[PDB]
Write a protein that binds this DNA or RNA. Structure first.
Length: 118
RNA sequence: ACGGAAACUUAAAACCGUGUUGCACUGCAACCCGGAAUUCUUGCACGUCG
């Protein structure tokens, strides 16, 4: 059926009366693909620092921000019905890939080193 | 029988022919459909044997 009807209940301690609730979730094995693109991020600045191209050292900071972005996200939620247990996810098979660009060989394999640190 | 009396300033001819209101321009940048609710409280596998 691809989507459960997971129930719930309310109990008010004035009278212990039952009030139901239904929280339809995803199936807990539903795997999704997951893509995102980074870039060499060449600045279009309002600020006076005109044509400030990020080099690899500014790039390699961001993969830790990719790491600690999703490392806590695996630990934390995604969805609603907050703080009752829904949405423990596990990001798997993370890989960066120079789709288009002139990235050097040494860099990209070290950019995946942050991706396994989660 | 007045230097008198008669007479068109008249006939035709195109202000026409060549010519783009055209070329450069992201309806774009930022935001979680997110927060708090017990599937619960009453309930014995048993009456029945000349």
């Amino acid at each position: 059926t691809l989507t459960e009807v997971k129930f719930e209940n309310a109990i008010n301690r004035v009278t212990a009366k039952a009030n139901p609730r239904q929280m339809e979730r995803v199936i807990p094995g539903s795997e999704f693909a997951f893509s995102l693109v980074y870039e060499v991020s060449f600045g279009t600045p309002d600020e006076e620092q005109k044509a400030s191209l990020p080099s690899s050292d500014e790039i390699i900071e961001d993969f830790n921000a990719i790491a600690r972005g999703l490392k806590l996200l695996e630990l934390d939620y995604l969805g609603g019905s907050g703080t009752r247990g829904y949405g423990q996810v596990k990001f798997s098979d993370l890989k960066a890939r120079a789709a288009v660009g002139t990235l050097d060989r040494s860099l990209l394999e070290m950019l995946n080193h942050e991706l396994a640190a989660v």
